Amino acid sequence: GIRCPKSWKCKAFKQRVLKRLLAMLRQHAF
């Protein structure tokens, strides 16, 4: 049913960035 914490927004940008930090973190560039 619901997705966001009581708010029909879910910034696509911040949404992706949240995961990006992980995907990039693992593939850190020494």
Side-chain angles (χ1 to χ4, degrees):
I2 318 302
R3 189 83 219 285
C4 271
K6 305 197 181 296
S7 40
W8 279 28
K9 288 185 68 158
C10 312
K11 210 102 283 182
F13 199 88
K14 189 247 261 59
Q15 281 252 97
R16 296 276 248 176
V17 185
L18 177 137
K19 276 256 188 224
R20 214 212 246 282
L21 243 290
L22 280 159
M24 181 134 201
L25 166 131
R26 249 89 112 73
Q27 215 144 119
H28 195 55
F30 196 92

